[PDB]
Amino acid sequence: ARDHRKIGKQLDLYHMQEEAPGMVFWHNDGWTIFRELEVFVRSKLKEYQYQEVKGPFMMDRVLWEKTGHWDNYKDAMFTTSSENREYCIKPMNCPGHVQIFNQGLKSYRDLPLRMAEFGSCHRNEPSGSLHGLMRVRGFTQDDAHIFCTEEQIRDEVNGCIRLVYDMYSTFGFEKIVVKLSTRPEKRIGSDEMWDRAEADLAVALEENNIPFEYQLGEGAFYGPKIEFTLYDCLDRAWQCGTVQLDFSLPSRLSASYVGEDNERKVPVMIHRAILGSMERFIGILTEEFAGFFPTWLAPVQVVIMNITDSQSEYVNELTQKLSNAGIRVKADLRNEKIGFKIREHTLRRVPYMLVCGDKEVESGKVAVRTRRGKDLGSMDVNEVIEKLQQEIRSRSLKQLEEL
Amino acid sequence: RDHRKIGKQLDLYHMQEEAPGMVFWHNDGWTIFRELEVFVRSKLKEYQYQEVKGPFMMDRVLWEKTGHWDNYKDAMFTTSSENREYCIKPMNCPGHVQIFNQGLKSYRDLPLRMAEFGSCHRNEPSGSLHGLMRVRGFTQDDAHIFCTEEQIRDEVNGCIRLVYDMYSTFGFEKIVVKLSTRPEKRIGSDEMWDRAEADLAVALEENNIPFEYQLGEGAFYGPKIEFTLYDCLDRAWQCGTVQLDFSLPSRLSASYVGEDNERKVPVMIHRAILGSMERFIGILTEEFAGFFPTWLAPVQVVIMNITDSQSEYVNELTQKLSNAGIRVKADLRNEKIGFKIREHTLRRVPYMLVCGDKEVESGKVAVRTRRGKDLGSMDVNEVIEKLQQEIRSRSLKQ
Ligand SMILES: C[C@@H](O)[C@H](N)C(=O)NS(=O)(=O)c1cccc(-c2ccc3n[nH]cc3c2)c1
Ligand SMILES: C[C@@H](O)[C@H](N)C(=O)NS(=O)(=O)c1cccc(-c2ccc3n[nH]cc3c2)c1
Ligand SMILES: [Zn+2]
Ligand SMILES: [Zn+2]
């Protein structure tokens, strides 16, 4: 079956070792993909008007007792101690986000406050359940919590729902199934609060014309969940996105704002992650493309090769020029024959391969080749640069000219 | 002027007793952090560094082999899973060596320069914590350079030049250089330390760099050049560092196929330019007294109306500047114009663009700076161009 663990070794993306179970060593080229995904999410955070923060890796166990995590996550939480106190390594970003909200006086005028983080979390998942990038102990969530009034729930859940379909469409995921995860057996909050949170999410889905199934007893301890599963090109299901309505944690953590009539009020909190674990999302993408990443995600977008020693200076000039123009480009000046070089970069799935022989030096042009074997012939360097810039800017799925 | 007070006033970050020495970065402070990462990335691109990311914890067994367990125990946070013990990472070096150890390397791959914005933790004594300067959770602009004996000079020189190159951008006038020599508890022979210490002094002298000795303060694995920066009370803080390590690669089985097909162990150079991102932000906060240069300022431009009558226009320009890459916010509040100007002056926002009825007809903007200087009427294209130029060149002034 397509396997990201094999593709990832082939393409030198990352590795794992038993010295750090379920924790990824990101090699240069894999980290390049991770960083480009973060650039993409940030573009969406800007458009959708989110803050971006960073909360600490560890906080005192007492805070985690207060939230309800200690009772409901105890087993899954890594603990460490210093000077007679115990700290939990964070399994979730939400408590940190509340501590940031709690700094200073908040007004109804500050709401809806949308707070995002690339949140680096750890959970002590059983070793026997771990699997490549898909099931890890250290994962990074494209997380956010929205602080809002009850009157704002509708519009904010809607914005989260749009964002899911918006973002998945960029990667070519258009087949999406939705579920509503209802009250678990171990939960905090009254049944009436639950009645209300569940109906709020059902109503949002209904008004969006999104059909769903129930997922009985699978909501969070703090609130119910809209869960979004995409299907890939092999029609495999991946549950990724989550939208969660929380009437419990803010009160538990003494969060408040001053309302219009100057009465003190507790905000509602919406939790959401669209990609889920970025580690897992990269694993899925690697399998979806079978290594043929779109140019905007490809770790190396262009390799420029000499025929021999003769054209080294020209290829060096070209490499520098394309790099200044923001393309991930490298020069292959090695000993070997032209066909040894192109095979190597073809198997590395580099989008474009520029060939530079004696006649290219004198014309100021490049012979352009793709990783799917297409001969794009001689091209001017400025044309090559402009078309790649356009491909990258637009985050296009396919290369030049095809169906 | 204290970074801690300024931090509160500009809403950059906070700390709490629930996590001593752990920073909560608010939006505006995280903004600064992120620009610094962009800047570091630009500088390392010209030097061909890779960028990686290693795990947050690794097995105690690995930390025993590196010598951290014996030479660094009280300073490490530990945790357990399924009866195995892990240290939360105090350093990124061992993780980088694990990546180097994947795949056969040859002399052709050297020098190999491997960088990481590495989030580490050290169990610093609580009484020694001080604001952003000394924290328990820190991020280094770290790198390790894997190289041959013959390449040490060149690569140490390259690190030294990178420190003065990057520091020139912020305009530091006082950079104190210390050479830190073998500590009491250390790994490696006295002969290795003789040769390591000599290489670093030779390198300083080759660049004609005035320096002092700081005996007994080097790392357990090797000597350190330290580039020292100073806070508003003139307290010293290590920022830049360049270190020479002939120990860890052998300890961790790193090797490469030489010129003559014999196996060799590479030399490692450790270096950080800014140091800790937290400490560096502390230093920059006091250095500039909050008036961050335009390229680093969390909000570069605030656009304000007088009344609801100009809102549409303020929104028009706010989307226009934003689309040009400028960090811009609209202030649409039913507050007096002098209340608005004072908040944004206090927040140290480089530029304030005021819009009344007059500006809506003319299609211009009234421009004022956080220094209270009146810049008069300007066209929106000239303001966009001025700013893109200040941002792109990363200028210190104006
Ligand atoms: C959405 C967040 O604000 C919420 N606080 C949360 O973590 N929800 S969640 O537990 O359902 C969640 C969301 C996304 C990812 C994960 C998660 C958790 C652990 C994992 N290991 N490998 C992949 C993993 C993914 C959990
Ligand atoms: C250069 C690195 O590769 C090296 N392995 C190292 O960690 N050297 S170092 O211990 O001297 C060092 C370098 C940079 C920052 C810190 C550091 C360490 C702990 C801190 N707490 N608050 C600010 C801190 C700064 C330590
Ligand atoms: Zn959450
Ligand atoms: Zn190091």
Q: Are B318 and B243 contained in the same domain?
A: no
Is B335 marked within a binding site?
yes
Q: Are B326 and B372 contained in the same domain?
A: yes
Is A141 an annotated catalytic residue?
Answer: yes
Interface mutation target, options A62, A80, A122, A320, chain B, most CBs of B under 10 Å: A80
Q: How many CB pairs under 8 A join A and B?
A: 130
Q: Count of residues for chain B?
A: 398
Q: Inter-chain contact B27–A89, Cβ cutoff 8 Å?
A: no
Q: Inter-chain contact B19–A104, Cβ cutoff 8 Å?
A: no
Residue A227 distance to chain B (closest CA, Å): 28
Distances (CA, A) of A216 to A225, A238, A241, A242, B265: 11, 19, 18, 16, 58
Whose alpha carbon is nearest atom 23 of ligand 2?
B134
Q: Are A164 and A25 contained in the same domain?
A: yes
Please name which of B114, B120, B391, B162 lies closest in space to residue B268, comparing C-alpha atoms.
Answer: B114
Please identify among residues 302-331 of chain A the ones whose CB lies closer than 8 Å to any CB of chain B: 323
Running DSSP on this structure, what letter comes out for residue B309? G
Q: Are B176 and B245 contained in the same domain?
A: yes
Domain that holds residue B336: 290-398
Domain-terminating residue out of A230, A256, A290: A290
Burial of B128 (0-12, 13-18, 19+ CB in 10 A): exposed
Please name which of B271, B351, B292 lies closest in space to residue B32, comparing C-alpha atoms.
Answer: B292
Please name which of B69, B64, B29, B56 lies closest in space to residue B120, comparing C-alpha atoms.
Answer: B56
Is A271 an annotated catalytic residue?
Answer: yes
Is B34 an annotated catalytic residue?
Answer: no
What DSSP element (H or E) covers B59? strand B57-59
CATH number assigned to the domain comprising residue A315: 3.40.50.800
Q: Are B347 and B212 contained in the same domain?
A: no
The verdict on B213 touching A (C-beta cutoff 8 Å) is no
Running DSSP on this structure, what letter comes out for residue A152? G
Distance CA(B1)–CA(B153), nearest Å, equals 40
Running DSSP on this structure, what letter comes out for residue A49? T
Number of domains in chain A: 2
CATH number assigned to the domain comprising residue B160: 3.30.930.10
Residue A117 distance to chain B (closest CA, Å): 10
Peptide bond into B223 cis (omega under 30): no
**B18: Cα separation from own chain's centroid:** 25
Running DSSP on this structure, what letter comes out for residue A291? T
Q: Are B241 and B321 contained in the same domain?
A: no
What's the gap in Å between B184 CA and the centre of ligand 1? 46
Is A123 marked within a binding site?
yes
First to last CA, chain B: 21
Catalytic residue among A123, A137, A187, A328: A123
Tokens of B152: 């040490």
What's the gap in Å between B271 CA and the centre of ligand 2? 9
Give backbone dihedrals phi and psi of A218, rounded to 5 degrees, phi first. -110, 5
Domain-terminating residue out of B289, B320, B355: B289
What DSSP element (H or E) covers A357? none
Q: Inter-chain contact A53–B33, Cβ cutoff 8 Å?
A: no
Q: Give the closest of B23, B50, B77 to A80, CB-based.
A: B77
Residue B332 distance to chain A (closest CA, Å): 12
**Strands B301-305, B351-355: parallel, antiparallel or unpaired by DSSP?**
parallel
Residues of A whose CB is below 8 A from B127:
none
Q: Inter-chain contact A63–B18, Cβ cutoff 8 Å?
A: yes
Which residues are within 8 A (CB) of A249 and not within 5 positions of it... i.e. 6 or more apart? Answer: A67, A68, A94, A95, A98, A222, A269
Which residue in chain A has the smallest CA separation from B57? A20
Distance CA(A137)–CA(A133), nearest Å, equals 10
Interface mutation target, options B50, B56, B108, chain A, most CBs of A under 10 Å: B56
This structure was determined by: X-ray
Q: How many CB atoms lie within 10 A of CB A52?
A: 21
3-state secondary structure of A388: helix
Is B374 marked within a binding site?
yes
**A281: Cα separation from own chain's centroid:** 6
Q: Are B285 and B300 contained in the same domain?
A: no
Please name which of B108, B191, B193, B111 lies closest in space to residue B149, comparing C-alpha atoms.
Answer: B111
| CA of B224, nearest ligand number | 2
Amino acid A121 reads C
**For chain A, what is the radius of gyration of the CA atoms?**
25
State the Cα torsion A317-A320-A323-A325 to the nearest 10°.
-70
Ligand 1 site residues, Cβ closer than 6 angstroms: A 92, 94, 123, 125, 135-136, 139, 141, 143, 242, 244, 271-273, 276-277, 280
Distance CA(B129)–CA(B301), nearest Å, equals 35
Is the Cβ atom of B300 under 6 angstroms away from ligand 2? no
Residue carrying structure tokens 């690339």: A118
Q: Are A181 and A58 contained in the same domain?
A: yes
Q: Are A272 and A334 contained in the same domain?
A: no
Which residue in chain A has the smallest CA separation from B100? A27
Whose alpha carbon is nearest atom 6 of ligand 2?
B91
**Ligand 1 pocket: which of A92, A226, A279 to mutate (most atoms <8 Å of CB)?**
A92
Residue A206 distance to chain B (closest CA, Å): 33
Q: Are B319 and B342 contained in the same domain?
A: yes
Is the Cβ atom of B96 under 6 angstroms away from ligand 2? no
Residue carrying structure tokens 């507790």: A266
State the Cα torsion B9-B139-B116-A52 to the nearest 10°.
-40
Please name which of B99, B102, B104, B79 lies closest in space to residue B89, comparing C-alpha atoms.
Answer: B79
Q: How many CB atoms lie within 10 A of CB A283?
A: 26
Distance CA(B96)–CA(B240), nearest Å, equals 19
Is B147 an annotated catalytic residue?
Answer: no
Domain-terminating residue out of B289, B321, B338: B289
Burial of A94 (0-12, 13-18, 19+ CB in 10 A): buried
Q: Are B29 and B83 contained in the same domain?
A: yes
Catalytic residue among A225, A328, A365, A371: A225
Is the Cβ atom of B283 under 6 angstroms away from ligand 2? no
**Ligand 1 pocket: which of A23, A164, A277, A284 to mutate (most atoms <8 Å of CB)?**
A277
Residue by residue, DSSP assigns B66-92 as: HTHHHHSGGG--EEEETTEEEEEPS-S
**A164: Cα separation from own chain's centroid:** 12
Q: Where are the beta strands (DSSP E) in A105-252?
A: 113-122, 138-148, 176-181, 212-215, 225-231, 237-246
- Resolution, Å (one decimal): 1.9
Is the Cβ atom of B273 under 6 angstroms away from ligand 2? no
Please identify among residues 136-195 of chain A the ones whose CB lies closer than 8 Å to any CB of chain B: 137-138
**A258: Cα separation from own chain's centroid:** 35
Distances (CA, A) of B177 to B57, B180, B207, B211, B227: 33, 10, 12, 5, 5
Please name which of B74, B86, B93 lies closest in space to residue B136, comparing C-alpha atoms.
Answer: B74
Distance CA(A196)–CA(B64), nearest Å, equals 54
Sign of CA dihedral A364, A370, A371, A375: negative
What's the gap in Å between B275 CA and the centre of ligand 2? 6
Amino acid A233 reads C
Residues of A whose CB is below 8 A from B322:
46
Residues of A whose CB is below 8 A from B126:
82-83
Residue by residue, DSSP assigns B105-132 as: -BGGG-SEEEEEEEEEE----GGG-BTT
Residue B71 distance to chain A (closest CA, Å): 18
Distance CA(A163)–CA(A155), nearest Å, equals 12
Q: Are B310 and B281 contained in the same domain?
A: no
Is A343 marked within a binding site?
yes
Please identify among residues 28-67 of chain B the ones whose CB lies closer than 8 Å to any CB of chain A: 30-31, 33-34, 45, 50-59, 61-62
